[PDB]
């Protein structure tokens, strides 16, 4: 299930001037656009080759929306400070996430449009794309405001229509990267840590997309409670990395097997030391 | 392609 997702961050700054507005847009785990209100002359900027060849009208219209969104978020931050009776002397953060998931019929599987204030849920469009869930009494002020303005109908029109159509266009123009999974390249390393013990570390490198599962088994049964996992992390080139480690008694290494599940793999992998 | 711009909070 492919997705397109936008991430807006608006941060007020007392005395330094206008709030800073940063936007990033992704298709699946691939970023394709960035906007930063603090840039020299702020403009939507390509981050993936399948939008770099879009013409000047595309980038002009994207830039105009980001500029207007920054101005509206500044008003929102001011209103929120009033809702919570907070100080001008403090900096505050307004975050927005929205986008569409592509369904098997090529239309919307689900749409979302969610907000957070200072790191906590503030208000969210419900999956019906018609009604809102407010997190506290302050967000109920916004909800009544957005209900009166029929904000949800405006957002629903984008999420069900324009969002899906952009996503389908991107998936076609970036077909050779966005619709081609990159299988993880795997190997196991061995490091004695104590002197009847050794760390077996199972590595997964260079895979796309980021979703992956790494599991250690001792005698066919999962060693979940003794497995250290790191969070999946970016390699910096568009691919991701992850590893899982267990401390095993020296001489028992050949019992342990690492198991790899990923979209780029026709069948799950089994590795041993 | 980004959404348009609606009401402030």
């Amino acid at each position, epitope marked *: 299930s492919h997705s397109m997702r936008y991430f807006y961050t608006a941060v007020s700054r007392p005395g330094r001037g206008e709030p800073r507005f940063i936007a990033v847009g992704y298709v699946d785990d691939t970023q394709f656009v960035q906007f930063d209100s603090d840039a020299a002359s702020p403009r939507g900027e390509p981050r993936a080759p399948w939008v770099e060849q879009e013409g000047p*009208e595309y980038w002009d*219209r994207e830039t105009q929306k980001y500029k207007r969104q920054a101005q509206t978020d500044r008003v929102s931050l001011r209103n929120l400070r009033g809702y919570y009776n907070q100080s001008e002397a403090g900096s505050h953060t307004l975050q927005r996430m929205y986008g569409c998931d592509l369904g098997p019929d090529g239309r919307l599987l689900r749409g979302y449009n969610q907000f957070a204030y200072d790191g906590k849920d503030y208000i969210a469009l419900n999956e019906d794309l018609r009604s809102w869930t407010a997190a506290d009494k302050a967000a109920q002020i916004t909800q009544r405001k957005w209900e009166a*303005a*029929r*904000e949800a109908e405006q957002r629903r029109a984008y999420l069900e*229509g324009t969002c899906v*159509e952009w996503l389908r266009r991107y998936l076609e123009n970036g077909k050779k990267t966005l619709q081609r999974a990159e299988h993880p390249k795997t190997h196991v390393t061995h490091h004695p840590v104590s002197d009847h013990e050794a760390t077996l570390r199972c590595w997964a490198l260079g895979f796309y997309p980021a979703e992956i599962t790494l599991t250690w088994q001792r005698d066919g049964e999962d060693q979940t409670q003794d497995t250290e996992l790191v969070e999946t992390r970016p390699a910096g080139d568009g691919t991701f990395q992850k590893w899982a480690a267990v401390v095993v008694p020296s001489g028992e290494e050949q019992r342990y097997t690492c198991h790899v599940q990923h979209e780029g793999l026709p069948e799950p992998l089994t590795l041993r030391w | 392609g980004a959404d348009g*711009v609606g009401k402030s909070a």
Partner: T-cell receptor
Amino acid sequence: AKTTQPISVDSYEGQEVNITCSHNNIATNDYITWYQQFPSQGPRFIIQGYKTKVTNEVASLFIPADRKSSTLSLPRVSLSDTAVYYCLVGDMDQAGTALIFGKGTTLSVSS
Amino acid sequence: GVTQSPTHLIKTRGQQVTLRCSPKSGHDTVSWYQQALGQGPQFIFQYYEEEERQRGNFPDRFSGHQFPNYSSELNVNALLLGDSALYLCASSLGQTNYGYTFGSGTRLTVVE
């Protein structure tokens, strides 16, 4: 994505009338909508679409696969359909560009 | 529907005018257009939340206003004969193009 359309179309009562409109520069965040302006009136909404054929009580709207043109189809015209017909390509993005009119097509109907 | 007033108006060269429009019930955005004879409507500006949000190719002597109740004024001073036109108002909700609804216009003729 500005529109271009014929200056005029002539017709007789009871026939199907088709008005075609060219908009080669249409974008993904543009939709298609048609208005009619009778004498002594402002333009009035007829029909809108994106990529699928649309049919309502007043007209059909045909949109080919590349969306670079569109055709308004009036089923069995009468004298009361005499008006100027405007094909518009409109920004779908909220707070984007307001609707910009091109020249439009004068439809006359004879008996 | 959209209410425009007056329906017709005559002014002499150099005078000033105020045209008025109330949006359709449920609409809060107002767009003004100038339609000269034999032409399509030409976009003047659009007002939302009491502020001009975009403007077409018209000089500063064309100015606008929007009241808290969403009603709008088109103000033109130093009128010229070429300003003679049908002035159209279109209303919508929150600056969307969907549901764009026009009034019947104000026919303004500037005479020598």
